[PDB]
Amino acid sequence: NNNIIKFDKARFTVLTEHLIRIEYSETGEFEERMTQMVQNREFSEVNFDIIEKEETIEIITSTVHLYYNGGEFTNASLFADVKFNFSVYSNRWYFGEKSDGNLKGTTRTLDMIDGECPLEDGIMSKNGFAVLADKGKVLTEVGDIAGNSVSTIDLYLFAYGRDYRQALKDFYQLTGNTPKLPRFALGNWWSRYYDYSDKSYLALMDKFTDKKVPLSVSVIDMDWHKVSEVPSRFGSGWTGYSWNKKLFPNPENFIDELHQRKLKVTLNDHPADGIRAFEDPYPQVAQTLDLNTELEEAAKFDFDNLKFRKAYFEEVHGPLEKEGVDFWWIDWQQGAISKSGVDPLWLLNHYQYQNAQKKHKNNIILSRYAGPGSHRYPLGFSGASVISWASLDFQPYFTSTASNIGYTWWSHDIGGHMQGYKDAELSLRWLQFGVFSPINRLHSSKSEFTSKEPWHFDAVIEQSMIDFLQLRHQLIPYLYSANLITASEGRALVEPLYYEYPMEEEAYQHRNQYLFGEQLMVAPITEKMNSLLQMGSVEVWFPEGTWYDFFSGQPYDGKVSLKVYREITEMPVFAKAGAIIPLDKNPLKKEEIPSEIIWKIFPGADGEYLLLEEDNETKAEFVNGIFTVTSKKESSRKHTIIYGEHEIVSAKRGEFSIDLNGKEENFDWNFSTALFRRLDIAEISYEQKDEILQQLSLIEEHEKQVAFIKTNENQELQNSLFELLYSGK
Amino acid sequence: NNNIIKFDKARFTVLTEHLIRIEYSETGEFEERMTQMVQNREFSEVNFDIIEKEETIEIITSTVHLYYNGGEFTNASLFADVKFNFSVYSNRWYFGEKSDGNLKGTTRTLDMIDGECPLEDGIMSKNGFAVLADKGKVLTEVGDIAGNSVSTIDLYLFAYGRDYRQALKDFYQLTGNTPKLPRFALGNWWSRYYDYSDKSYLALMDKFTDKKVPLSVSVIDMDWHKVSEVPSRFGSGWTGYSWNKKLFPNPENFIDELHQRKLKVTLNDHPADGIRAFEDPYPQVAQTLDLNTELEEAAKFDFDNLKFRKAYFEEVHGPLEKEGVDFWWIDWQQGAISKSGVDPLWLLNHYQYQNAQKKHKNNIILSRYAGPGSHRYPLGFSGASVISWASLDFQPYFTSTASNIGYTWWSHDIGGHMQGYKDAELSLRWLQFGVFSPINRLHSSKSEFTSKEPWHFDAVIEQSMIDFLQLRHQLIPYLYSANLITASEGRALVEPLYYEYPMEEEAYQHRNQYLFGEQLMVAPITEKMNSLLQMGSVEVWFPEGTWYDFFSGQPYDGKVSLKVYREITEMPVFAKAGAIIPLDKNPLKKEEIPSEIIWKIFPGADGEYLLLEEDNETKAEFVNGIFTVTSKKESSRKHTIIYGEHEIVSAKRGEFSIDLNGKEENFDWNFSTALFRRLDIAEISYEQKDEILQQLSLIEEHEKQVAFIKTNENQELQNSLFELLYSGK
Ligand SMILES: OC[C@H]1O[C@H](O[C@@H]2[C@@H](O)[C@H](O)[C@@H](CO)O[C@@H]2O)[C@H](O)[C@@H](O)[C@@H]1O
Ligand SMILES: OC[C@H]1O[C@H](O[C@@H]2[C@@H](O)[C@H](O)[C@@H](CO)O[C@@H]2O)[C@H](O)[C@@H](O)[C@@H]1O
């Protein structure tokens, strides 16, 4: 190709104006095969310039000068200057050196992590460049490990500046797009490390129904299999493939009962101890792999081995799938060691994700992160987080930052996994985040005390958790449409603020704030409430524009950074003027696609929303106060329209237009009501409540209302009253 | 042998069902010679199974699957699964990787350590396996360094589960048993880094006699030799082999005076600066080693050199031994560097211990730890600890943990060596520990202020120190018998609780608690007293059974964890019902073996004790209330019997039986007396003392006495009163 240049023992491939592959080969042969990371090097032709001399070469694109002075790659022989001025002297890449600016990516797991842990670099940098080293093995055409690359150094130089979304799109072109999730993945999951019986598990599922909590997935953790019943001469019961018959005397009947309740079923698989001689599938595996059964030779875990993988999928997973298991929870914690040098977690995720496609369309796994490109094998499973405010306070940042290495379907244990401390408010705040996260999977440790059941908690916490869990199912249309946009267009559901606002310094200073799809901006509260206010808080950056609280309609004039206060039952979620958000009107109703959609419209600007579905596309347009709904294909679906406050149209069938110009634009939210509520719940002196209510009611000029609150001895009460005055300005 | 298997470039020797030697050789030759660590690979034949294929081999014992997939040893090619379930997923060894569970071993020294330091691994693991790498040089038949092993990798896989005692016994079979100590090593040692004269040293020894403090050993520290008198052109006076004639004008006469007082004599040797031209032995060494005397060529320290070692033993140590020096204090702090790659400390301990056997039977050294197998060269010398509560609080744990690498004769500086802070209570608590430690050597720094003389302190501390120092000599029969059991049966004097109680979680949660021989359990107090109670405390785990305070007879019903309180003059030491402890009746009497033994019997169960001596064995049996004493050989020895409280038999000669069924079983210890004493010393309000004494005397029901103390505002006073109520239940 014209986009390929060889010089000395190096090869340079200009894939885009902003993406260059850099290779070294001692043998003069360069690698064309796919790798664990890279699935596609076919990119459209681009323009660039070369200065080639006897001893040096310079490649020049719109954004980078790449220099190579010959010989082995060193920090002196191979380096690049970006054509940007984001920094004063951090604009140069040197081979093998780190530079400042990397916005980070993700890491394997949150196992044993209490609050923050270090992350790996991503492809995004504030200074406009990043290098992604390909250190993986080569694949065969069908996707088996083929061995070592002939490109003994193989690098990707990203020089996208702050065009983060295009960097991610081209990353997906190189490493392959995320597959589409199935709709069931986007609902509530129930999970608990608890030794349920068939009877007590179904009783709990029927209790969820009675309690008005919708579920899409039934996880069965490791007590599904033999544990204490495993003879100690075999080792532990951690790995198992044999039903505990006391708890599950008829597995297929139990899974049929979950299927009748419209639940998808997954089992915990700890693969590391393989198939030992006590297991129900051992006789078939032993025959297939020619094991010495009289010496009880184990089929040790070996995912490098084709015969082992075949026996694992066909003779170990196969019978369980025949009993009705829908997909696999791969729960690997036993290290990165294999004869091939390929991480066993990568081999599991790559091969299990492929195998899952045989029994179901668009199937998933649930497994830990296995390095760049492992977004091809959703879903991510972050694992055994410590239950703490610190862990919750890290998790939104962790989740949005992961989009910087394209790993956009993290499923966290909602409420935290293990250890840590009880606080029903922490559980409630964690569920609020989970509902506005990629995946909402409730899960917990082997403790008698860590159940995430809403009715574990008092009546106030229970009702709020049920409300948020119902909200998750109202959001499934929005989530599923965003899912198809991840798969087809390479856009993350969860974006850091700096994707949309790359030149705003405040977009780098609100770590836990994120865009959730294209219509909603989320600022979860991740700190214990101030008991004097009976409210939690978070500093929100409002971009330019008019913003509304998604729930209350409280308005905010951007651009501003403003501390916002919410009771423990309320979450800061915001929509711009013109936002249109579809909601399922019947989130409890078991139906493959919603029979009724609520179109929730935020007044004050034009907008539009495209609802992508399995078998349809529905466009909602809001232009000069006219709201129109059209679909590719006709259906019996009934549309409800909510314009700000008021339901305008109920259950209208087919395509239509309606003029909202003559309809009430304003939400109910008002300063006086909100003020009374904040003063009333506050654990402060009644004389202070009386004086604040009286003075803020009497003083007419906004600047003097602000001067009055500025004299308050309670600094946080000042900030709370200021938020109300700012919204009421 | 049938217990030897070769595969690819590896050799496997199944030594026991639980011990496998693993070797790699590039040359196809494997190492049969002894190493610095390994003295014996002759073990009885055991049964095991092999699965041998073209490309892989599995060795199967009762406790382990060892796997080798061929090629170089890597974490992927060489690994093992234990046949235990102590952990859920820590049951696999990978070559070159660390696993969880190791209970630790020891380290070279406590030089400069204030409190805790890291330890090396031992052979004991809660998860049931450990690997001991042999990285040492090979020896010749006579025990000189021969060079590099032909087994370029040589490992021992221990898979004993929690059978810690058998692991240690088989370690001793592999590395050689600890030699027997001489009886004199088990008495009190006097030492001080102080420039005594012959006259002032003998005056101090005669003061010990006047003060009723028995001593076995007289240490003379480095001021025995020239120090400030060394010309600076030679370097320092740290190394020396020449008596300071001002302080010791007639060395042989001074050593004769110590010998007349029945003291063994050792001198400090700092070897690192060798024999320089100013030294008294230099002319003879210079002639032997062909040194250039007109250029004053030093005989530099070189323990790799046979001629240097010979000149060191014969011409440097030899003349000092002729003057009466009994054994060598090797005080090496100058690093691990030698041309051979053998640690100079190992060469010193190995060769000096061997050389010490020429002049005396069962002789010792005193030197720092030199790695696994260096237990062959007792005694251990921990060195220059910082004087602090933190150092004392580490030391019992340090001492018992060392049994996990078979190094069971640590001698710590009792009271701490240097720096740190004065606190007479710290000195007293440290001596209490020392008396119940492997070796009781009083030692201290060059400070005018750090003498460990009891009469340095006030009358209360002095009398308590004298009492404990007399107790050490009462314990010599018990210690000497345990010493012969270390040498012949591979059982440590000091054991961690988990040797006796491997399946009790509490046996892993009391770091400073230990078994001391087979009859006594020790819980030293290592924290400054609570001034409100005038008592120190430690949480004691009492195993199942009835336990008695060794000193008071206070009873405790196991199994329980209970905070116990003692005045600064009292130490928590416990014996089970049926315990029999021999004591020397005449600890001050200079005699090679005791003329009188007290048999101290704890009522409530059967028991027995075997007293091993130089030239006898005496069995004490307590069966259905009949106490019998028999001996292999007859003697004039007089036996005293103490049954609980009461001396039953005084000074009875020869073998005999006596029926104690009709004798008072109960100790005097009573709740009311102990209660009055604790309230009386407490620095609390007299109104509180009055109310506690009155209410605990009046309230009859035990549960209501406990409810009464539960209301006390002093939380530690609650725990102290609770200990008394628990003992009085
Ligand atoms: O399948 C059970 C459980 O396994 C993993 O978590 C474990 C955790 O619950 C346990 O406390 C620790 C202690 O060893 O080990 C694992 O981390 C898995 O992450 C979790 O989701 C499962 O519920
Ligand atoms: O022989 C004297 C002394 O030497 C060693 O301890 C030294 C110590 O007392 C001194 O303060 C420091 C400072 O350099 O050096 C050595 O650690 C030896 O450990 C000790 O037992 C001796 O008493």
Side-chain angles (χ1 to χ4, degrees), chain A residues 111 193 221-222 238 268 270 329 331 333 368 381 383-384 413 417-418 443-446, chain B residues 88-89:
Chain A
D111 293 334
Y193 182 6
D221 206 348
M222 60 171 285
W238 197 251
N268 184 274
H270 297 142
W329 176 15
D331 183 12
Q333 304 173 274
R368 294 171 178 74
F381 168 51
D413 294 4
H417 183 65
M418 69 185 185
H443 184 44
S444 67
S445 65
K446 187 51 144 181
Chain B
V88 289
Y89 55 81

Side-chain angles (χ1 to χ4, degrees), chain B residues 102 113 139 167 173 188 190 272 281 368 384 434 448 470 481 486 511 592 607 611 684:
Chain B
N102 197 279
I113 308 306
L139 304 192
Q173 191 169 329
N188 301 319
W190 175 257
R368 294 171 178 74
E448 291 283 300
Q470 295 174 354
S481 186
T486 301
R511 275 158 58 104
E592 295 195 330
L611 184 72
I684 63 171

Side-chain angles (χ1 to χ4, degrees), chain A residues 505-556:
Chain A
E505 188 46 32
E506 282 296 277
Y508 301 88
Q509 300 296 324
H510 294 85
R511 275 158 58 104
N512 283 344
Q513 196 172 326
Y514 52 99
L515 299 193
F516 178 82
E518 298 182 56
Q519 303 285 335
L520 292 173
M521 183 175 68
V522 185
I525 288 164
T526 61
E527 294 188 2
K528 196 171 179 47
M529 73 173 183
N530 177 335
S531 72
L532 288 193
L533 302 184
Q534 296 286 300
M535 296 183 75
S537 56
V538 58
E539 190 188 271
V540 182
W541 176 61
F542 293 95
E544 273 267 293
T546 306
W547 293 87
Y548 295 92
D549 186 287
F550 177 70
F551 301 100
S552 75
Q554 182 174 346
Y556 304 83

